[PDB]
A paper describes a structure:
CpxA is the sensor kinase of the CpxRA system, a conserved Gram-negative envelope stress response that responds to perturbations to envelope protein homeostasis. Instead, CpxA senses a wide variety of cues that result from envelope stress, especially those arising from misfolded proteins that affect inner membrane integrity. While extracytoplasmic sensor domains adopt a variety of folds, many sensor kinases (and other sensory proteins such as chemotaxis proteins) possess Per-ARNT-Sim (PAS)-like domains in this region. While CpxA contains a PAS domain that is largely similar to the PAS folds of other sensor kinases, CpxA’s “non-canonical” dimer structure regulates its ability to sense periplasmic triggers; diverse inputs that disrupt the stability of the CpxA-SD dimer appear to activate CpxA kinase activity.
Like CpxA in Vibrio parahaemolyticus (CpxA-SDVib), E. coli CpxA-SD (CpxA-SDEC) adopts a PAS-like fold with each globular domain consisting of three α-helices surrounding a five-stranded antiparallel β-sheet in the canonical 2-5-1-4-3 topology. Like other extracytoplasmic PAS domains, CpxA-SD contains a long N-terminal helix (α1). However, this helix does not form the extreme N terminus of the structure, instead containing an N-cap motif at its N terminus and an extended tail region that folds against the β3 strand of the main PAS β-sheet (see later in Results for further discussion of this region). Overall, the monomer structure of CpxA-SDEC is similar to that of the CpxA-SDVib, with an RMSD of 2.9 Å over 108 atoms. While most of these are hydrophobes buried within the PAS domain, asparagine 107 (N107), lysine 121 (K121), and tyrosine 123 (Y123) are notable exceptions. These residues are also located within the deleted region of the constitutively activated and signal blind cpxA24 allele (Δ92–123) and form a hydrogen bond network connecting the α3 helix and β3 strand in our crystal structure. The asymmetric unit of the crystal provided a dimer structure of CpxA-SD where the main dimer interface centers around its ɑ1 helices, which cross each other roughly perpendicularly.
Numbering used by the authors: 2 to 117
């Protein structure tokens, strides 16, 4: 588990703000409520990267089946949004958590990106 660079912290805060703003302007009238969330994180992912949302109940939005093992391992070690971190898993790297408010619901936001 590794400390973020100032640039990585700024990027996360910036992305969390854009995801929060997107959701604030997107009415929650979907038949599939999670699709609204996927629209926001698909749109604001940085090039070549993806975003994940985790609910307070421990459910992951945006992940592939192949990724649940490393996502599980990472979050099992992660701290609060007061101390986001990063970890490499072979060819990918997980970064977070960041924080996304959506009305009364709160999510943790993670980035998944090619490792470097």
């Amino acid at each position: 588990m590794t400390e973020l660079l100032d640039s990585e912290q700024r990027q996360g805060l910036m992305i969390e703000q854009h995801v929060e703003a997107e959701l604030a302007n997107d009415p929650p009238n979907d038949l599939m409520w999670w699709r609204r969330l996927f629209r926001a994180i698909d749109k604001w992912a940085p090039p070549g990267q993806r975003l994940l949302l985790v609910t307070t109940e421990g459910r992951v939005i945006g992940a592939e089946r192949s990724e649940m093992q490393i996502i599980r391992n990472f979050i099992g070690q992660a701290d609060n949004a007061d101390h986001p971190q990063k970890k490499k898993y072979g060819r990918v790297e997980l970064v977070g958590p960041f924080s996304v408010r959506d009305g009364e619901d709160n999510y943790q936001l993670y980035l998944i990106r090619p490792a470097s």
